[PDB]
Amino acid sequence: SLHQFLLEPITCHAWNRDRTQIALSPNNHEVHIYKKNGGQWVKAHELKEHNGHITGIDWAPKSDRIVTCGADRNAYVWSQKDGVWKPTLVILRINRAATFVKWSPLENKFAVGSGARLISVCYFESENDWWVSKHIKKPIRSTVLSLDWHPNNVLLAAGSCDFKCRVFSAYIKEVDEKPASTPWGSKMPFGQLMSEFGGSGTGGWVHGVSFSASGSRLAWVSHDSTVSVADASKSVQVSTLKTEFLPLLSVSFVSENSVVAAGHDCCPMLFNYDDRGCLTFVSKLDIALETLHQNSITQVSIYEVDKQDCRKFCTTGIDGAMTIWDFK
Amino acid sequence: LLRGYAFNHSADFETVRMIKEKLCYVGYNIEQEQKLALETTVLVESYTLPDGRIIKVGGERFEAPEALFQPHLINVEGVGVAELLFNTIQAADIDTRSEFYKHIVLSGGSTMYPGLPSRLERELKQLYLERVLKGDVEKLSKFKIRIEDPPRRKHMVFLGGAVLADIMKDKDNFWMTRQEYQEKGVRVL
């Protein structure tokens, strides 16, 4: 089921808890909020404070708050206290352009990936009412392009242009409580490298990373047309599959065993990972071009209630069309 | 005006201001700017007007903002912002000069061009490595210079006023009372 919002590309998209409202950015310095009045999408609100290209949005559902980041070295936190949305200021202390933003499972911190060889973890302070940041910078050598969060609200995956996929810990003692022991490691100070991967010789830029529901498995896609899954329960082990298609730009877990991917071929695909450590291609999911999307897909999200029970998933990309895909 | 586009001085002042705000930037290295302007067409951009016409702005993007660093291009006698900053820091007592090198803050709306942060650092480092410490390129590492420029530069006059009125909201000596001018007519604070 395809819907065409605008002819311009969609940089990024965000959903809310009831899957009623959607936030979009049509390749400009603005954010548009749309709602569904019956069976037709009609625009609802406009948010305009940036003076640069907007690069990332996310929507914390339980608190109902929208975090926005862009290439003007700014970030804002939008909240709805009256009929009109209002912003709140974030101090980031970066000198290059931001590239990614994401909320945490507990909705108390959020992580921003930027091009100054930094990862900024920001948390709230109310004595003077803004957000203050802490930096992770030790082993990173280039710009970060992807981020993800662990279910236990401490660990943080990151992919960067230096052909590496890393797992850090982002424990902030002022906000968070002490964590338990994970297979990934035991000793978890702030900004300590927990694990590193990326040794394959002909490594390319990593565009997307993702954790599983169990939290003990990581998956990432690269620009050399390869997908890879790293397991940490039995041992710190990797399994890499070399696909014969164009590069993939996003990845997300559907369950413990299956992973869904999308990219420049305009068609989402499904891979299977066995318990014994083997990746095998299964099939496409879309059996002018002979494909519903007319350009590269940039973002894949879950319409359903995420990795515990996932049934449908949403795709959006440069063509301007947004599509909902159902497995059944 | 030297492309076939005629904008009168009075009635089209606010139409070219949007072009300046949207498409202008300060170059880091002039050489690569001219190489990309002469042998490549990735600097030309099309701007739509209210009348419906489409104009094209090319190499003029990085020539207009450089009246700041070279002031003689529009008939102004001086030294430019980078050298005037040097002449201002190198005019105080010796002990406090380090206190000013580390903390330079940019404010105002006419310092939001892309690259203006990254050019003053290079100009000051080169102006301080051939005027004060001539040659001997080892001690510049110990010489720390830093420029602060948060993405909230435009309203820094307001935000400061948003703090000073908050701290001193209650005690009734900060303000000039109405009754003071009923008798005295002047102020000493």
Partner: peptide, 30 residues
């Protein structure tokens, strides 16, 4: 010759807490 201020000392203000509050701002911003 002259003090750091490069001016005559202002005896009226000499004859007659912001710094406490500003430290948190200085920490958070920098």
């Amino acid at each position: 010759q002259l003090p750091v201020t490069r001016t005559k000392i202002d005896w009226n203000k000499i004859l007659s807490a912001l710094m406490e509050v500003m430290q948190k701002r200085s920490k958070a911003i920098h």
